[PDB]
Amino acid sequence: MVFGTLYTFPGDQCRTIAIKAVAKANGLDLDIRETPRTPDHLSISKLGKVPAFQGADSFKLFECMAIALYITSQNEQTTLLGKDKKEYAEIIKWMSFFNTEIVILMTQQLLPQLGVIPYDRDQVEFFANMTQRSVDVVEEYLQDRTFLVGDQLSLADLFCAGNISLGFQFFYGKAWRQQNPNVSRWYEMVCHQPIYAAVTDKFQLLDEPKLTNNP
Template sequence: MNHNKLYTYKGGPRSIGILAVAHAIKFDIEVVETNPQVGLSEEYLKLNKLGKTPTFVGSDGTVLTECMAIALHVASQDPESRMLGPTHMDFIHIVSWMSLCNTDVVKRMAAWIMPLLGVAPYSPEGVEMAKKQTAQVIQILEDHLQDRRYLVADCLTLADPFCAGLVSFGFANVFDKEWRAHFPYFTTWYEMVTSLEMYRAVIPNTVMAETALGPPKPSMRSDFTVDD
């Protein structure tokens, strides 16, 4: 018997929301541990030619390789839930927030965090610029959440666990206590979403940095250049 499978690695930010929603609507997915950092099989590269995660393979043979498409597909498996919003316009807003977080937020966070982890070229100026650019885009979420509990409508939707999963990388590494004080509404929303049973079924313990990562030690610094 074929099963729905999600190829990803434990704690993968782009997979957390997918698995949380699957848990909430009781949609069975078998997680196949797949981490590009430790190598990929030829079989996997036939499914995802870019060698990225996550990848979804449905019990009917459907293959999806983009996290937003996977999340929307999984959430649609229970038409009675409100994960895709009560109205069509709510659905449009859900996709909009997912897109913002999966592009602008993730790219800016990565430009801030990856050099500090020693897996991308480090320069103080570049990191500081990325930090400011991250704050700029997070401010959009902060302003939006000032008078809202959820990102869309008056109920939990796919946008909440999906976006919370994406920004978990920031909270774990650089969104420290001092930084969080500047974004209280965004932080409260994140704490609310990550405390939900559906989220804790995937990530039982949420990590929130007390102190942001500092510059990498010389031995950690990457030898890669922009051309790489």
């Protein structure tokens, strides 16, 4: 049967890819609802935030990290949560870092350029820079590393790749990829893992950025 219901937006959302991916890998079928702010969604997330999740259980969850972790843990033989307590903590670290120091700031960089939140290039430039100095941490970390954590694919690879994909959809052109080769190489690798590619549209990179200022 269906293991539960996941409320999200249409397509390949930054905070949802990794959740779909580990569900299909662990053999848990999800019903996907792509219409936010319905009574059943707000029953989980009173604020109407995506992603939100309800088990067939009807066990309720919000926060993308919690949903990803709960799904992943269903498989007591999983390989994706590290070898030992150290590596588990590293996975928590990178998930939390990508969710707060990259996605949040990149969103402040992006929304003004789409019209959503009010616009100001001096403010938009501030966030582009802060976003980039956080990504720089990852660029340098991945020098001579293949995976974020240990020697095989983990939930952090899938979750954080999914997060950063926002950057590859809008800002990260060939030029950017030239200055950020390790992140580019790692991202491109995660996106070609079967577990991840199974639940996403076809991989594709920008030539020119779709965005600079002003709009």
